[PDB]
Design a binder for this molecule. Structure first.
Ligand SMILES: CCN(Cc1cccnc1)C(=O)CN(c1ccc(OC)nc1)S(=O)(=O)c1ccccc1C
Ligand SMILES: CCCCCCCC/C=C\CCCCCCCC(=O)O
Length: 504
């Protein structure tokens, strides 16, 4: 009997902290197994839960459950008894299942980051399907099972002689080069390469969702306006020395290939030869390229219905203008995010924008006028069209903008929460696996710990990094409960049906 030999040896390495590691493993085992079963049940029960991101998350809870059941109990025994009580066959299988599950975890988290990046950042904004997500999951298991074959090849149960003897399970390499090169590759494949890729991907996602599209709900509101829009526009034109008329506005830098003021100026030259041009009013707000400023200043001197503002304006002033002008012109060549369109439409201004980038996303047929980018003759026709629309009431058109900009910002706020939760998961994944991955390279790649000063401290750190790996699987369901309202509700429904029979 192996266990009798352990009782005969137990005096040599008595661990008085065994209860703590045991209670910590019992706690993680129940929470990891319970929380991850609900994650599967929540996505498999609710069809509105079956998103690409959640199908990958189910795959994480599947690898999480698979090791919680097959690997955690054996790891608890080994770290406490320093002995392999299971067979030589399980000495290959358990280490294989543990490493495979670490690979399936990392590649799945990397696939979630790619799927978010192609959907949020790439200009095509691909919408992945569930069949595409399932084929990647099948590939992830196949690739993970194949790369971990060499790991099963080298595990070997052997008898150690400290005259009562161990049986231990460990890697057995022929030669001192292969393990060092292998664990360098194990480090890059499981942790360093996937974690770098995710940092680069979520940094672009954060900067776009939080800054480049993060409009201020509370500031850009129509509630800050007073009176009727007619009274504001009339006071607006009176300040600039102009008669009441249909008002167009351009706000942006004076650029060569970017914001398109050169297109607007070319458009104003086209319209200026028509009698209808005397009905329109143009506010052009910006500065930059001196020759464009001199072109806009020259049109302003020529026409009593053009007004150029080169001085800096406060957000409240621009908000007042969005609430008073009839239309806002955005003739950008390049506009990934379209933040000025969301701000204008939130205050009722009607956008006349290039059909590119975020303007093409934001502006619909019912909530603005799109035009081919860089085309002055297209933009002149649109400004002529907007004037024809202005002979009738525009209130239903303005209310469609406000609702469309609100619904679009409502979508950005929903994408922020999902990306924020995914970022917490990868952050906690780097925290949990960092100790074991660093301790594995110091031990296997650099030879540390061989000449031990304090072996008890080193064996204690290894036991901690191990528990921390299983703790990560207990942590993720708790992350979904606190950062996703759809998981938080479906979790509550699973407890009521299980403990009460209540529907939800
Ligand atoms: C190369 C594997 N490795 C390093 C490592 C880096 C990153 C992620 N996982 C493991 C190890 O520490 C080694 N192994 C290990 C140990 C404890 C543990 O606790 C979660 N997890 C894995 S092992 O080879 O799989 C092994 C060996 C002996 C008994 C059981 C097991 C599972
Ligand atoms: C399109 C499915 C991709 C599946 C993951 C493959 C990642 C590459 C792994 C290399 C080791």
């Amino acid at each position: 009997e192996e266990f009798l030999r352990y009782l005969w040896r137990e005096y040599l390495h008595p661990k008085e902290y065994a209860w703590v590691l045991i209670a910590g493993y019992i706690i993680v085992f129940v929470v990891a197994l319970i929380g991850n079963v609900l994650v599967c049940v929540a996505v498999w029960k609710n069809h509105h839960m079956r998103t690409v991101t959640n199908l990958f998350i189910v795959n994480l809870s599947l690898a999480a459950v698979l090791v919680t059941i097959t690997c955690l109990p054996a790891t608890l025994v080994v770290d406490i008894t320093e002995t392999w009580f299971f067979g030589q066959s399980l000495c290959k299988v358990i280490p294989y299942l543990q490493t495979v599950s670490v690979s399936v975890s990392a590649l799945t988290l990397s696939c979630i980051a790619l799927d978010r990046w192609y959907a949020i950042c790439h200009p095509l904004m691909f919408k992945s399907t569930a069949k595409r997500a399932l084929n990647s999951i099948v590939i992830i298991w196949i690739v993970s099972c194949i790369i971990m074959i060499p790991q099963a090849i080298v595990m070997e149960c052997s008898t150690v002689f400290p005259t009562t003897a161990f049986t231990v399970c460990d890697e057995r390499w022929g030669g001192e080069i292969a393990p060092k090169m292998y664990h360098i590759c194990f480090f890059l494949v499981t942790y360093a390469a996937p974690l770098c890729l995710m940092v680069l991907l979520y940094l672009q996602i954060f900067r776009k969702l939080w800054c480049r599209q993060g409009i201020d709900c509370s500031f850009w509101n129509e509630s800050y306006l007073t009176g009727s829009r007619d009274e504001r526009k009339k006071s607006l034109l009176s300040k600039f020395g102009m008669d009441e008329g249909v008002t167009f506005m351009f706000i942006g830098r004076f650029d060569r290939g970017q914001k398109g003021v050169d297109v607007l100026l070319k458009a104003i030259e086209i319209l200026s030869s028509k009698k209808e041009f005397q009905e329109m009013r143009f506010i052009i707000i910006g500065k930059g390229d001196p020759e464009l400023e001199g072109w806009a200043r020259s049109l302003e001197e020529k026409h009593g219905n053009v007004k150029v503002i080169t001085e800096m304006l406060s957000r409240e002033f621009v908000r007042e203008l969005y609430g008073s002008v009839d239309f806002v012109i955005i003739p950008s060549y390049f506009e990934p995010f379209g933040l000025v369109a969301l701000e204008a439409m939130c205050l009722g201004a009607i956008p006349i924008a290039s059909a590119v980038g975020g303007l093409r996303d934001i502006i619909t047929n019912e909530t603005g006028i799109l035009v081919k980018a860089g085309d002055p003759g297209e933009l002149a026709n649109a400004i002529l069209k907007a004037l024809e629309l202005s002979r009738s009431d525009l209130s239903k058109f303005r209310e469609n903008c406000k609702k469309r900009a609100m619904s679009f910002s409502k979508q950005i706020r929903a994408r922020r929460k999902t990306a924020r939760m995914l970022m917490v998961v990868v952050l906690v994944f780097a925290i949990c696996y960092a100790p074991i991955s660093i301790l594995n390279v110091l031990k296997r790649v650099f030879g540390m710990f061989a000449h031990t000063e304090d072996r008890e401290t080193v064996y204690a750190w290894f036991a901690f990094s191990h528990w921390l790996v299983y703790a990560n699987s207990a942590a993720n369901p708790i992350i979904y409960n606190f950062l996703s309202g759809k998981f938080r509700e479906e979790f509550k429904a699973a407890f009521s049906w299980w403990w009460l029979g209540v529907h939800h």
